[PDB]
Design a protein around this nucleic acid. Structure first.
Ligand code: MN
Ligand code: MN
Lengths: 189, 187, 185
DNA sequence: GCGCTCGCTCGCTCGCTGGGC
DNA sequence: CGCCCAGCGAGCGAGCGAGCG
């Protein structure tokens, strides 16, 4: 049961959108669910609002092309350094590596149309599948589930902004630092 | 007119029933002076298929039917192995690997019933280095007299060619001995 | 901020090498130069100028660093005319310099030499950390310029080019060269 | 030093794949 | 049903350079 990784960068500005009027980005207030132990004040809501649409729309489209509704996914939204970015992990089922690119460009175009009103973002490499090499000419990387505990779960605030999954073992972990800490230590095994 | 070299290992391998490997009896053609008793027939039977299927496929990918080749099957200390020499025409070095895998796969399907052989490095193109990162080697015709023709029994098992100058030499020790000595006469 | 060094040799034979365009450019020292125009050989300089201009055009393409720092000095050596090209390492990892420099080398041959490789032994050579085989591509820092390039005087010094602010004046000025050498020491 | 070794790098090649039209 | 062509990615091999003796 392997995963492809797509990294999607998210800015702080957007089209259309402006603070002087009502828009879909600014109108959304976010709340942590009861079972979260995170600090809402370190979570930047406008970028999170955009991220949520992007991953929701990504997975809707993904399910169309893969013909696998119920495909397993783990999505984590992060604040770098330079850019906000989302790691999207999506199960390979229904999408042979040979054919991922032609499908991801359909999804990429759809996201531009719907979220960005037809205007491609100017962020440098804003929609990028993870390859087996740093340079040109590698294969689309397939990572197994252990990527999540090894690389995603350890992230803490404010780098960690939000996460989403339909994987049972990680539902609790998405927004719980203590549960993240537990699965990380339980994975060293 | 240069050659690529592919070395294909063949194993020493059911006896309770009829199969294509065991059913074949081999005989030396009349013009051969070799000793049939030093030739191991089950491995030779497999080798013949491998080289026949190799060259059928090679012709497809090269678009050169009538491509020149020399194939020699040998018994080493460890493994039986065949040296396949095939003319470079139609197959740039950049592109040899992608084509040889297609051939390798076809051999596994047809001869090995889809089960890859467990022999260590059983299908190996000759490179310009012993390690990784060299080029595909191109040898000219003189490789045959220098390195292939001198082999004698039981190291020499069999050979095949469509090169007019070496037809006689395949299975004739005296003719091998002659072309070897005639090749030094040229140096 | 380090530099790779490429040494490019340039041949002596206006004529009759049959490449007559080296004769057709007249050179002038800019006003601020104190050099003697009569000790500057213009046909070889004419070629050298094209070589370094084209080298740096190509260097920018492969490095993806327009505005890369460089210092180029053209010399009349004991054996050949040659230019020392110093170019900033940015954008070009040492592992990959060779594959890029051959592209540049081939470009120069096509464009300056009309496809005919020069017969000068070793005419396009990166500086290594050893005299023999098996060393690394050398990285020198800026101080190479004052220590080894700036002291050269006429007629060994023929010409220089740079986009480094501190050395603009020094390219064609012996007094300014003399000053930066003493200020460095 | 100095000639050589050999595991490794990565920009680039180009026949193949298979949705879209 | 047959082309188109963006995506594919193993294979390529000159170049690399610490290490060896
Ligand atoms: Mn042998
Ligand atoms: Mn010098």
């Amino acid at each position: 049961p392997g995963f492809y990784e797509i990294v999607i960068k998210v800015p702080s500005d957007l089209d259309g959108i402006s603070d002087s009027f009502v828009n879909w980005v600014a109108e959304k207030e976010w709340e942590l669910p009861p079972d979260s132990d995170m600090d809402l004040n370190l979570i930047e809501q406008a970028p999170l609002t955009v991220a949520e649409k992007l991953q929701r729309d990504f997975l809707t489209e993904w399910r169309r092309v893969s013909k696998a509704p119920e495909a397993l996914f783990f999505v984590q939204f992060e604040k770098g350094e330079s850019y906000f970015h989302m790691h999207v992990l999506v199960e390979t089922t229904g999408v042979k590596s040979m054919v991922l690119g032609r499908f991801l460009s359909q999804i990429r175009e759809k996201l531009i149309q719907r979220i960005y009103r037809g205007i491609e973002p100017t962020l440098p490499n804003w929609f990028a599948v993870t390859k087996t090499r740093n340079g040109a000419g590698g294969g689309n990387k397939v990572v197994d589930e252990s990527y999540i505990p090894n690389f995603l779960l350890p992230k803490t605030q404010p780098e960690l902004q939000w996460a989403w999954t339909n994987m049972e073992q990680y539902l609790s972990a998405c927004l719980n630092l203590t549960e993240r800490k537990r699965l990380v230590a339980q994975h060293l095994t």
